[PDB]
Amino acid sequence: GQSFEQWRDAFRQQALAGGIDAQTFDRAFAGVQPDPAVVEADRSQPEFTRPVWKYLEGALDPLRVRQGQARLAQHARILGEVDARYAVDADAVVAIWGMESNYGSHMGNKNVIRSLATLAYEGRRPEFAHAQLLAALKILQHGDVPASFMIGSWAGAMGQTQFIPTTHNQYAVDFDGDGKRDIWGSPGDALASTANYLKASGWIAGQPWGFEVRLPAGFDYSLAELTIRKPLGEWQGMGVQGVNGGPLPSGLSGEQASLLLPAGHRGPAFLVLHNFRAILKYNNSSAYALAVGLLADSFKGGGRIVGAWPLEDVPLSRSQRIELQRQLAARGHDPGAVDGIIGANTRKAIRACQQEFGWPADGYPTPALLDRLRT
Ligand SMILES: [Ca+2]
C-alpha cells in the first residue's frame, strides 16, 4: 500500500494466510508506525571506514575482555552444560555473545515488529523484511517473548544473540525447558542458542579458529584467499612458520587452512581453520571473525598480535573504492562490476595491477595504489 496503514492491512492478509492469528497480529502492530531511524540505517552508505587495527582495538578493549571473563565465571555451570551438550567451546560462545550484544547489554532498543514493518513498507530490501516479519510474528504467536519486549537492531537482529527471526526459528534453543526460546531475557537460552548455531555451522570443539604466523621473503601473497585452502603441513613446507619462528602446531598438520592478511603484506598474517569458517556463518566479515577468535583467546591470556600493523593504513573511502574499480578496468584489469565492494573479482584485478607495478600481489588496495593509477 502507498500509506503505511494500507500496506499494513494488505500485509495482514498475508500474515493470516501464513498462519498468524488476529489477536497476535493486532497485538504486535498496536501503535506501530514507520521508524525513520530504521529507514536511515537502511539507506546509510558510510563514506569512511576505520582500519582493521582500530576495529580490533575496539573489539578487544580490556573492558570487554574482563567482562567476558566475568561472564565465564558467573555462568560457569550453564556454559559447562552447553559446552558439553553441543560440543562447542565456552570461550567461543562467550566471545560471540560479547561481539553481538556486549553480553546482553546492547541488544538495540528497537521493536523488531516496528523495524521490520518499516523495511517491508519502504526499505531497500522488502523481500528480506517481509520474510523476517512473518517469522517474527510466528515467534510472538508461539509465545517465546511478549511483543512489548521483542527488541533488537534496526535490521531485525534480535536479543542477546542478534539472531534474525528465521535464524531464531531454526536454531534457537529452550535451555531450561519452560517452553520458551527466550534469547532476550534468559542467559541459558541465549548461550545454548549461540552454541547450537555454531555447532550447526561446523564447530569442532577444542580446535583453534586459527593463529598468527610469520611469512617468508618473496611469499606468494596471491594465496591469501578464503577459497584457497591447504593442509597446515603444506603451508609449513611452503615457508610459513609459527609467529616467533619455527614449525606450526603438530597434530593439526592435516587440517585445511587459509591465509588471512587483514592489512596486506606489511601487516600480520594468520592461518585460519574450519572454526573460523563457522564464525563467518554468524557474520560474514573476516574482521568480525578475527575479532571473535582473538577475543576468545584473550579470555585465557592470549589474543594479541606479534606482527606490527602498518602505520599508513588509511582505508579507501567508499567513493575511492568505486574510483579504484573504474581505474582498474580502465587499465585492462577487469574487477567485475563497479559496486564499491572489494570482493574476489576486485582482488583479482588488484593483484594483476600490483604485479604490473612490480608490487607484492596481496590484493589489498591502498591510497597509494589509487595514486599510482591516476598518474
Ligand atoms: Ca527457556
Automatic annotation (TrEMBL):
GO biological process, one term: peptidoglycan catabolic process
Lineage: superkingdom: Bacteria
Keywords for this protein: Calcium, Metal-binding, Signal
Keyword Metal-binding in annotation: yes
Binding residues annotated for Ca(2+), in chain numbering: 174, 176, 178, 180, 189
Residues annotated for N-acetyl-D-glucosamine binding in this entry: 164, 167, 282
Boundaries of every Transglycosylase SLT domain copy: 3-297
Domain spans labelled Peptidoglycan binding-like: 318-373
Coiled-coil residue spans: none
GO function term, MF aspect, one: metal ion binding
Official protein name in the record: Lytic murein transglycosylase
UniProt organism field: Pseudomonas aeruginosa (strain ATCC 15692 / DSM 22644 / CIP 104116 / JCM 14847 / LMG 12228 / 1C / PRS 101 / PAO1)
